Amino acid sequence: SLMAAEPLTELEESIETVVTTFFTFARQEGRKDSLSVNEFKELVTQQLPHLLKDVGSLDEKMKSLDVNQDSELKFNEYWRLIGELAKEIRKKK
Amino acid sequence: AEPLTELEESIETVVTTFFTFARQEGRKDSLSVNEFKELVTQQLPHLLKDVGSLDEKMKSLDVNQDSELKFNEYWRLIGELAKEIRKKKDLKI
Ligand SMILES: [Ca+2]
Ligand SMILES: [Ca+2]
Ligand SMILES: [Ca+2]
Ligand SMILES: [Ca+2]
């Protein structure tokens, strides 16, 4: 495929990175398709230290994002967080 | 000065791409059908390679039917693309 040899656009690569980051952190312990509270804290520390610099308690943040209260953040819950961050970014513009 | 992480820059790129295309014509905070077509063909040529008419896709995204894609409708599209990538990054065997 000719398009297969074309590098991802800057947007496509960014979207893919958002998704890969989730699985990179979610595979560290327990269920591989969900963030434990500790995996979530590592994600924030490692990858979201600036955008979430003023979020306050990460334990509480975990709780608010865990909308189905199952103690884990599956991709859809993680995605909701990314949306919240994107909205904040949109406002700095 | 505190430099962004890979994840943070990726999220920022998704937001800035929207505005880069929305400022072209009419309202600068929303995509006309024409700006949407250019964002897709320019910046989403792989991820939306197998998309049909762009005129219909625009209709599907424009949920409030006002012929403009504001950031939240564009975000819905990003979520869709993210979900598909997610399925690939976490293959069930
Ligand atoms: Ca896990
Ligand atoms: Ca949950
Ligand atoms: Ca516009
Ligand atoms: Ca609309």
From Swiss-Prot, chain A:
Bilayer-spanning residue ranges: none
Chain residues that bind Ca(2+) 2: D66, N68, D70, E72, E77
Location in or out of the cell: Cytoplasm; Secreted
Phosphoserine found at: S34
Highest taxon listed in the record's lineage: Eukaryota
Cited CDD domains: S-100A13 (cd05022)
InterPro entries: EF-hand-dom_pair, S100_Ca-bd_sub
Main function: Plays a role in the export of proteins that lack a signal peptide and are secreted by an alternative pathway. Binds two calcium ions per subunit. Binds one copper ion. Binding of one copper ion does not interfere with calcium binding. Required for the copper-dependent stress-induced export of IL1A and FGF1. The calcium-free protein binds to lipid vesicles containing phosphatidylserine, but not to vesicles containing phosphatidylcholine.
Name of the molecule in the record: Protein S100-A13
Annotated source species: Homo sapiens
Organism ancestry: Eukaryota, Metazoa, Chordata, Craniata, Vertebrata
Swiss-Prot record, chain B:
Chain positions found as Phosphoserine: S30
Residues that bind Ca(2+) 1: S30, E35
Amino acids binding Ca(2+) 2: D62, N64, D66, E68, E73
Single GO term (MF): zinc ion binding
Keyword vocabulary terms for this entry: Calcium, Copper, Cytoplasm, Lipid-binding, Metal-binding, Phosphoprotein, Protein transport, Repeat, Secreted, Transport
EF-hand domain: residues covered: 16-51
A Gene Ontology biological process term: positive regulation of interleukin-1 alpha production
SUPFAM superfamilies: EF-hand
GO cellular component, one term: perinuclear region of cytoplasm
Tissue distribution of the protein: Expressed in heart and skeletal muscle.
Subcellular location: Cytoplasm; Secreted
Assembly description: Homodimer. Part of a copper-dependent multiprotein complex containing S100A13, FGF1 and SYT1. Interacts with FGF1 and SYT1. Interacts with IL1A.
Function: Plays a role in the export of proteins that lack a signal peptide and are secreted by an alternative pathway. Binds two calcium ions per subunit. Binds one copper ion. Binding of one copper ion does not interfere with calcium binding. Required for the copper-dependent stress-induced export of IL1A and FGF1. The calcium-free protein binds to lipid vesicles containing phosphatidylserine, but not to vesicles containing phosphatidylcholine.
UniProt xrefs under PANTHER family: PROTEIN S100-A13, S100 CALCIUM-BINDING PROTEIN
Protein name per Swiss-Prot or TrEMBL: Protein S100-A13
Source species of the chain: Homo sapiens (Human)
